[PDB]
Amino acid sequence: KSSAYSSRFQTPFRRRREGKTDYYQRKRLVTQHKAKYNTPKYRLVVRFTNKDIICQIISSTITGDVVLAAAYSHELPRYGITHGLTNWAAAYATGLLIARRTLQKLGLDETYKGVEEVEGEYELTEAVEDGPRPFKVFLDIGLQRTTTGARVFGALKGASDGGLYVPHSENRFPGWDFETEEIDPELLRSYIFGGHVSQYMEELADDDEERFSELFKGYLADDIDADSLEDIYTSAHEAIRADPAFKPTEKKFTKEQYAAESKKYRQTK
Amino acid sequence: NHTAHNQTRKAHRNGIKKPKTYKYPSLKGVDPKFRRNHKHALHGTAKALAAA
Amino acid sequence: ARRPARCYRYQKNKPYPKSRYNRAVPDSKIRIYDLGKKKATVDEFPLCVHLVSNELEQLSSEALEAARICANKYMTTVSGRDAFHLRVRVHPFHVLRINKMMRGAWGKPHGLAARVDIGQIIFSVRTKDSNKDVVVEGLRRARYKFPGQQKIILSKKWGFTNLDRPEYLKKREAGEVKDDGAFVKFLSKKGSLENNIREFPEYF
Amino acid sequence: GKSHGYRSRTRYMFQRDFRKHGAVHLSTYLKVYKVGDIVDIKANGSIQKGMPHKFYQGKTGVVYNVTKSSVGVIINKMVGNRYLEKRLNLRVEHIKHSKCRQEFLERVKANAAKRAEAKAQGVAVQLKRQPAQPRESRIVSTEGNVPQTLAPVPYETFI
Amino acid sequence: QNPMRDLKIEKLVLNISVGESGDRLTRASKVLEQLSGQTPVQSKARYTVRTFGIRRNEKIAVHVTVRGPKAEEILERGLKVKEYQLRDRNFSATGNFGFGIDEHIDLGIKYDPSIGIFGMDFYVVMNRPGARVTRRKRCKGTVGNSHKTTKEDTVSWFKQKYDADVLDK
RNA sequence: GGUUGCGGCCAUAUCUACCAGAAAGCACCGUUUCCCGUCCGAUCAACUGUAGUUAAGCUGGUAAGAGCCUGACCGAGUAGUGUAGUGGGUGACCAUACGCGAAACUCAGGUGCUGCAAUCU
RNA sequence: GAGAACAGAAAUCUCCAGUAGAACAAAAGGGUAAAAGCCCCCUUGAUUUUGAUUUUCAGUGUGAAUACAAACCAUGAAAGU
RNA sequence: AAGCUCGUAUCAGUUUUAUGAGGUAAAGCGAAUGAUUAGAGGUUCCGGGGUCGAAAUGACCUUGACCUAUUCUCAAACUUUAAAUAUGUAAGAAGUCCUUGUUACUUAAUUGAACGUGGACAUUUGAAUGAAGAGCUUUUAGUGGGCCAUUUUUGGUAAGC
């Protein structure tokens, strides 16, 4: 193009060129009642890549955001989940994980236990009587389009069942009836564990057997049938109560051997 | 029709006076939500300093 | 009817050009601004004689016309139409108001004018070195028409260009110069190499 | 007739700086504001809700209130032969802290710290500022820089 | 050569413009149901003129998009309606093309009496895999010059497939 | 050092034309049983990461490139301007004294820096 | 701009570019691009109580606006508005 | 005019340092929006002609537009940029630091917020000059036709307009 176009062009912000943010929404989340002067405004950031889930507790400062705690789907094998890592179930598990991580990184894991026996009900985390208040965070789904049944409201549910008071309304959880404006909790509890995957597996296991294995080639490794997912995911839910703390990997190198190779691939000037 | 000659001279004769700012200004335009708690705070401070 | 030009001479008011705010304006009497061998290269006519001002006044679109005519009727009739290139620099855009009638003393446009400052070219004549005695006289018969002290100048620049004679020859001896219809295209030492070499292949 | 409105004569005044249209950068809603703070005013025509009047453009004032999405400032205004206090409520996009105080407070820190230092040293110091005093004596060398004589230049050969 | 570089088709649009509205458009809409299995969409008008007698918000044209192997099938049975002969002018810049036909029963449909004869436009578009990025919400972007379909690649693919007749006139 | 998520400053980051990219990662690519959404599982939702791949995307380079940023013995202490005179000039305008002082051209250089967490031969 | 039968300068359809050159009830200016513009869904904050403040301004009114408090509501998954 | 409270405070038609706002002059238009002269290199299935032509989505002259780099000159109601003068604010005692008491506001919170106690700093008490005293109140007279000059400047041809 010509020069008059470029010399009077305006570059949008870097992350709006990259497409990874919405400032019209960030201005609504980050900003706070000024009489609440320097207090933070905590967001449950949640993102669904092609094969991994990210969850984060994010505060906002001037020179970038600040991460209190975060969770990724690729450590759930520490508790027992090995396949179906981008799932409504894995989202609920990771929400419970991040919640139970933060609620002892702050020191409230005893007062607010959340719900220990899920039944798929819309229940908001109340405050204790004459004690600390729940951890009040909010939620921002990226550029995602909210639709009922989404993978992300599973994480919302796991969070609120962990205890950290994410306000929400049931009309985007699945099993909500547009007609009568009510919810079916049993369908929701089915989707918590394997209800949209186990049913499909035990459908194809007598409809089309070869294709069932072509897709679920991994669920036949340790001999997981399409009924053990309940006792698997609840054992995950309980181990997360047992030991939600983050314990990082062990590195084969020390951040200089890592850099030495890329320093002879990066194609300097 | 609006000959504004000799107005600044009249102004500067008797002086252009600043408003004489005070300590403890008026709390009329402030947040009532804060005003009430400030009120209830000062009485507690007075009760705490009467004994002490 | 017309006013005398000794009324609208000096830069008194601020300029009031033609636009949507001032749409209906009578058109100028000068329309031509270029005469002689227009389609003639910079190589033919090296020498440039200007006609500079010495005051700050207004020039009328009919004065420019009757000066151009009496400067072109001499050169063309004594040397030849293809001997020179004459260019009028200034253009009349200012507009002049008249109270043809003080309740509602606004004025209706009837003429145009050209704003000049202390040091400003009006006429620029491009010729060879063997035609300056004619050029100077042809501009002498023009300084009589429009008012003021106007001094004729013999430039150091080549033609209507910006470079002096020997600097321009330095540039021409290499491939740093290409011709246009009647102007030039200098070769920068910056830009896209491929396009820079496509044109000006005599260089390098 | 003549018009005296609320945004008259604000054509070149409230239009954004060139190549700065669009959303406001988030560091406007995160620079926190307390009472007693001192601020300047610059209004942006992208946020029509919370504007000042054109008289309060470029002015400077002190804060006296803090609410959601907005603050309130005290500004002294000339009219007739006295100054009137004006308590006006603005949003935060139209506000920037004034560095006149953030450059003063560091000098407070510096002179306080050096009054604590000299009070440990055993010296009596000066910490009032002073203007640019005149230049002192010096000896100017001629070892490499011999003076180059000069003369003015004529009119001809320049023209 | 390369997987995810072949000029795979993505969709085909069966546009029909009539010029007027009424039962005519419904008889233009009860025809594509069998030819596609999907409902058409009735396109609304845009401007005004006396020659064609149209006004805004009026339905004069109808079309349907179709993807998957159904577009391939329909094009295979609709190109021997043309004897597989296509002209270079029918190929656009970006390597997508199309063509008109007049007899909408030339495909072999069980002729409905109540509709008659009206033609049918086709315009098929293709794109090498990985063109999602121009459509998705998060992290949009364009595709490189090494990945853009053109007349050159499309006539190659259309000579390699369909076994002949691209009239390079 | 590379990468992801969230980002701050918002072109030194953009734009055009090519080239290269181990590692993981990101991404594309596989299927529609389910919530859901579309005229069109194209987008969007969900499922497996299982089947294939860097060609795109993405990152990094290259261009005596366009554009942008920085800077001065470039232009220029010029144009303009506050003050002064029983200064000049028919006047327009101009000069000088005290002071401030640009822009455009020109030339040279630069072509993202970084913040929290996680991860990579 | 390149393309598709009837189809043209133009009806409908598809692709590339596209910093606004469009539209925003109304004059002009300003402002606005995952919106303040187009389409759709839900809606009545176009509501009650009185106050504080800005503008023209004697710092009187009237008109129009700005930011809060006590209530009730909508809308949104939510911050929020 | 009457005075009242006070006694060099903290004010000032002032400068300096620091820190902000403007869109006037100037400059620019081979940068946007408009106005504008010139020829050159170009493009047509597409503005009109002439020629070869049965006719061509056919060839050559030709002329305007669109394309491209160039060129002459402008804008009070165009502008990337952007001065001079004038203008807003701060330069401490009603201050700084430490300690930590109150509350029905606020915080995930013994969180910050506002106001505080008790300590330390009080001498160059935090730029210059000067200060014929600073502050405050009441009451009322006359006026409420203006004019001349330097500079800026609008109508007007111009005026002791």
Residue numbers in the entry:
A (entry chain P): 8 to 276
B (entry chain a): 6 to 57
C (entry chain q): 2 to 102, 115 to 217
D (entry chain T): 2 to 160
E (entry chain E): 6 to 174
Q: Can you provide the manuscript's text about this entry?
A:
Rearrangement of H38 to the mature position (state IV) is followed by partial (state V) then full (state VI) retraction of the L1 stalk. While the initial docking of uL16 to the upper surface of H89 is still compatible with the retention of Nmd3 on the particle, it promotes a ~ 65° rotation of H38 away from Nmd3 to adopt its mature conformation, thereby sandwiching uL16 in the cleft formed by H38 and H89. The initial docking of uL16 is fully compatible with retention of Nmd3 on the pre-60S particle. Furthermore, the β4–5 loop of Nmd3 stabilises the ‘closed’ conformation of base A2971 through specific interactions with the side chains of K204 (helix α2), K224, F242 (strand β5), Y240 and the backbone amide of S238 (β4–5 loop). As a result, the uL16 P-site loop is unable to extend into the PTC in state IV because of a steric clash with the Nmd3 β4–5 hairpin loop.
Following their assembly in the nucleus, pre-60S ribosomal subunits are exported to the cytoplasm where they are converted to translation-competent particles. Analysis by single-particle cryo-EM with extensive 3D classification yielded a series of structures (hereafter termed states I-VI) that likely reflect sequential snapshots of final cytoplasmic pre-60S maturation. Sequential maturation of the cytoplasmic pre-60S subunit couples dramatic conformational rearrangements of two long flexible helices (the L1 stalk and H38) to recruitment of the final ribosomal proteins (eL40 and uL16) and assembly factor displacement. In conclusion, we have used single-particle cryo-EM to demonstrate the conformational changes during cytoplasmic 60S subunit maturation that couple incorporation of the ribosomal proteins eL40 and uL16 to the release of Nmd3 in what is likely to be a universal mechanism in eukaryotes.
